[PDB]
Design a protein around this nucleic acid. Structure first.
Ligand SMILES: Cc1ccnc2c1NC(=O)c1cccnc1N2C1CC1
Ligand SMILES: [Mg+2]
Lengths: 545, 403
RNA sequence: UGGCGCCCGAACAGGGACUUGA
């Protein structure tokens, strides 16, 4: 009693069905397999084909014995299917439901008939062989999930059409049915759905066996009115390995979406340049406190709320230093739908404003995925500071909607390069050259007063030579300088106004730039006899060229 | 009889992933897709079709009704041979010389003819669901899809007979449809041109179906002019001219650089000598002339670069090879209220491509100066064109940004 | 046995900046 339409399945073009000899199994395995096949055949989902069909697929039973058929060759030969539900719904995007069930559909893929022209391709043999074939979707097959999902969607369509209030979600085989009605009528509606599915052959557990809330789904603990992640337990040990810190980082990342203020930047940094899993990397001083603070965050229960379409969506971003941003997406105060963190320094040179914009992009992209609308942000950056940034920036940055929240860690531009030359300052023509093979470079500057300087550099690339030359200009000078660097890379490094950088040399450069009250960074093409640049290359290139 | 359609050899159906959409866009899409299915334009499909195409909903200019567009760029590339060689639309070279050109919309006429059964599976698209709480509704096109470059190629057979009475009654009117639109150009008065367009529109409604190209002028590079030439000003001028030498072979900076021999402060007003005055005059004369040796190559796809000059001013260059700008312009801001940059970039992209379609008949490959996530999320909101060009995201070098 | 999220590494392709030799 399964009147379900069979989805046509066609083999890939130019390839024929699997032809693999079934490796002999032990006597116990053979007896278990034949017993399982005999009963399954009785159910009507298995039939005998004899030697007429040449295709075959090996089988093996894994300990009762659970039969497993490896469709490796068939999965790589069947036409690609479109698994529409590639992702999963975040709990924050759901809505408060008064009552919900799970309705775990028994024999999910074993109740949907298989295409009549394709059953001969899923053939398999049982050693004495007794060849069989699947008349329904077999477990482990590539097309079994997509076809079953479509079959259930079509089965639920007549019921969902007549029950608009009831919300039904199918992940793999469980049907999370939310009604928002009274428990007395909700149970009756569930019974109606259970009988409707039974009409199509699908079986569901009795009301006495229905799982009670909260429902453990994909790492979450979903109560009818609130959601939370599964209990996160951080190992308490001293000898921390790469694999163990991997577990710690992944678990903290999972908890980050609800628990606020979780930092994983230091722990992730501990994974740089490490390959073997047995490397006993001791927790650094900068990361031990961070781990203890996270343990303090995770030592209490934090329960999120569900989306309310009749309320405004807010996303208050916060800054905790070291290029780490935390956002609490909430609709009502202290009722965060879902917290998060954006610890990702895109590129080696970025500032707070650019990082904040990237965090905004991340929040907008996920909010649209989860809620389909961009939240009303509450950023800490001043309105004028943002205007000063995006108007004098080369990208098309734009923040949709946001007010100003006066949190202690405000976002600001630490320094701004002068737009015009400085009258009365001292010009610094800075350049550097690095030897091609010896890796020895030089950096120097020349000024109007005649000041000269050249510092030998070792194991420094050419780019670092230009950066060092600028650093020297920022060091041996006053509060007003007109640096003339003939390297476009240096301009890219400085004109972007990075608040912090991965490299220490740039960090020193920006540290000196902040001190300067007025700094101007000009540019002249190299090898053109322009001003003091030729007199600088004549100094910084003596033993290099 | 449906015209057979086959993809390019060795190419398989478009398996693109749908970009997430806002609640308003998803609701509108379902509202209009259900009506399309009711009318037979599209039909539902099962899970046996692995081909998907992105779908976005937009509000057409001077309209409030949602207009679905399908990102058929990947399919257009797959069917490139078919719509570029098997069936093609000749480009009238006189369209770009017309006083007034109006971009009509004849895309609704493609639904009047069926699509080849063996090709419908490649036009499938998915409508995303909010939060993925329910599987996205999957459809396929039973008729010539809008936005697919093969649709105008197949429909040109009926289009020629549709426009024949008008093309014969008004031989001075040049008509050229690229993807879904219908560029009508004429050397008539604006009021009379609109009257003619109204007559053409009636000619299209019976069968069941603004631009000023003469106002387009290149934006030549102009050097700054001032009486006090400080060392920094000359340093910037020399650098700009040195970069311009790649575009203009005749640019020379030997005399200008001769003035900067010694080490001098950036705020020193060094006076230009007679030889340098002549050198600057020659550079000015060269920079106010079209680039020599540059010609359009139909076999090479156009490339468009966009720069953000700031204060709402955007400069763009269309070229096929580096330093071979076929057309340089400046997109003065039209909307944005000094607060939106993505909206202005989208408007610039639409204007640039519309110019390319009118001139060369193809959409240039864009190099947008914008973050991938910012554009991918907000380009669909301000988009109002039935067509989509190819774009890539790159970082604009500071030197070439000075125009 | 496969898929998915994140990190590290390598081989890849093009785009940009720069150095040296011819
Ligand atoms: C795991 C899951 C995924 C998507 N939606 C839901 C659920 N499960 C729930 O328990 C749930 C809880 C609260 C509201 N909706 C819920 N449901 C909806 C169906 C009623
Ligand atoms: Mg040099």
């Amino acid at each position: 009693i399964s009147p379900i339409e069979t989805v046509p399945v066609k083999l890939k073009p130019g390839m024929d069905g699997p032809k693999v000899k079934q490796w002999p199994l032990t006597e116990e395995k053979i007896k278990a397999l034949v017993e399982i096949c005999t009963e399954m055949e009785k159910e009507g989902k298995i039939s005998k084909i004899g030697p007429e069909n040449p295709y075959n697929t090996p089988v093996f039973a894994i300990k009762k014995w659970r039969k497993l058929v490896d469709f490796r060759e068939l999965n790589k030969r069947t036409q690609d299917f479109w698994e529409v539900q590639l992702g999963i719904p975040h709990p924050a995007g759901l809505k408060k439901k008064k009552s919900v069930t799970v309705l775990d559909v028994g024999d999910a893929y074993f109740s949907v008939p298989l295409d009549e022209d394709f059953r001969k391709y899923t053939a398999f043999t049982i050693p004495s062989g007794i060849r069989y074939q699947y008349n329904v979707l077999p477990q482990g097959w590539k097309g079994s999930p997509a076809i079953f999902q479509s079959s259930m969607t079509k089965i639920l369509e007549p019921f969902k059409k007549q029950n608009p209030d009831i919300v039904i979600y199918q992940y793999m085989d469980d049907l999370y049915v939310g009604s928002d009605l009274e428990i007395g009528q909700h149970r009756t509606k569930i019974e109606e759905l259970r009988q409707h599915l039974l009409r199509w052959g699908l079986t569901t557990p009795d009301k006495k066996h229905q799982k009670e809330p909260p429902f453990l789904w994909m790492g979450y603990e979903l109560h009818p009115d609130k959601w939370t992640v599964q209990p996160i337990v951080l190992p308490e040990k001293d000898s921390w390995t790469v694999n163990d810190i991997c577990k710690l980082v992944g678990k903290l990342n999972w908890a980050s979406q609800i628990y606020p203020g979780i930092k994983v930047r230091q722990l992730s940094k501990l994974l740089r340049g490490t390959k073997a899993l047995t490397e006993v990397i001791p927790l650094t001083e900068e990361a031990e406190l961070e781990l203890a603070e996270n343990r303090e965050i995770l030592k209490e229960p934090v329960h999120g709320v569900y989306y309310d379409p009749s309320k405004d969506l807010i996303a208050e971003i916060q800054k905790q230093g070291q290029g780490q941003w935390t956002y609490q997406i909430y609709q009502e105060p202290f009722k965060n739908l879902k917290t998060g963190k954006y610890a990702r320094m895109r590129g080696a040179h970025t500032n707070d404003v650019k990082q904040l914009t990237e965090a905004v992009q991340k929040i907008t992209t996920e909010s649209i995925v989860i809620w389909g609308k961009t939240p009303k942000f509450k950023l800490p950056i001043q309105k004028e500071t943002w205007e000063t940034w995006w108007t004098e920036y080369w990208q098309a940055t734009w923040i949709p909607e946001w007010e100003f929240v006066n949190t202690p860690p405000l976002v600001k531009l630490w320094y701004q390069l002068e737009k015009e030359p400085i009258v009365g300052a001292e010009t610094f023509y800075v350049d550097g050259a690095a030897n091609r093979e010896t890796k020895l470079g030089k950096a120097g500057y020349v000024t109007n007063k005649g000041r000269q300087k050249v510092v030998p550099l070792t194991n420094t690339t050419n780019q670092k030579t230009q950066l060092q030359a600028i650093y020297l200009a920022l060091q041996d000078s006053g509060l007003e300088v007109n640096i003339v660097t003939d390297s476009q890379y240096a301009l890219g490094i400085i004109q972007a106004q990075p608040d912090k950088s991965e490299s220490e040399l740039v960090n020193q450069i920006i540290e000196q730039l902040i001190k300067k009250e007025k700094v101007y960074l000009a540019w002249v093409p190299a090898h053109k006899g322009i001003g003091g640049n030729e007199q600088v290359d004549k100094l910084v290139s003596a033993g290099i060229r | 009889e449906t015209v057979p359609v086959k993809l390019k050899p060795g190419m398989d159906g478009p398996k693109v992933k749908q970009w997430p959409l806002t609640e308003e866009k998803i609701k509108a899409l379902v509202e209009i897709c259900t009506e399309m299915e009711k009318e037979g334009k599209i039909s539902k499909i099962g899970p046996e079709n692995p081909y998907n195409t992105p779908v976005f909903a937009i509000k057409k200019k001077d309209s409030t009704k949602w207009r679905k567009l399908v990102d058929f760029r990947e399919l257009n590339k797959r069917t490139q041979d078919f719509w570029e060689v098997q069936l093609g639309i000749p480009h009238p070279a006189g369209l770009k010389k017309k006083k007034s050109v109006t971009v009509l919309d004849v895309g609704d006429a493609y639904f009047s003819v069926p699509l080849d059964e063996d090709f419908r599976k490649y036009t499938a698209f998915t409508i995303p669901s909010i939060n993925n709480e329910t599987p996205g509704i999957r459809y396929q096109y039973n008729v010539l899809p809008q936005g697919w470059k093969g649709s105008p190629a197949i429909f040109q057979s009926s289009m020629t007979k549709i426009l024949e009475p008008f093309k014969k009654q008004n031989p001075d009117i040049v008509i050229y449809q690229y993807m879904d639109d219908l560029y009508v150009g004429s050397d008539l008065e604006i009021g009379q041109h609109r009257t003619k367009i109204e007559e053409l529109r009636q000619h299209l409604l019976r069968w069941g179906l603004e631009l000023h190209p003469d106002k387009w002028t290149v934006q030549p590079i102009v050097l700054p002019e001032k009486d006090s030439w400080t060392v920094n000003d000359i340093q910037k001028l020399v650098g700009k001219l040195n970069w311009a030498s790649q575009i203009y072979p005749g640019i020379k900076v030997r005399q200008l650089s001769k003035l900067l021999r010694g080490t001098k402060a950036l705020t020193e007003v060094i006076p230009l000598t007679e030889e340098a005055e002549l050198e600057l005059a020659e550079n000015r004369e060269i920079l106010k002339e079209p680039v020599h040796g540059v010609y359009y190559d139909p076999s090479k796809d156009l490339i468009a670069e966009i720069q953000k000059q700031g204060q709402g001013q955007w400069t763009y260059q269309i070229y096929q090879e580096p330093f071979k700008n076929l057309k340089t312009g400046k997109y003065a801001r039209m909307r944005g209220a000094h607060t939106n940059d993505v909206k202005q970039l989208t408007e610039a992209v639409q204007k640039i491509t519309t110019e390319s379609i009118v001139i060369w008949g193809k959409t240039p490959k864009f190099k947008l100066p914008i973050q991938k996530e910012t554009w991918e999320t907000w380009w669909t909101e301000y988009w109002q064109a039935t067509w989509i060009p190819e774009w890539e995201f790159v970082n604009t070098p500071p030197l070439v940004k000075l125009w």
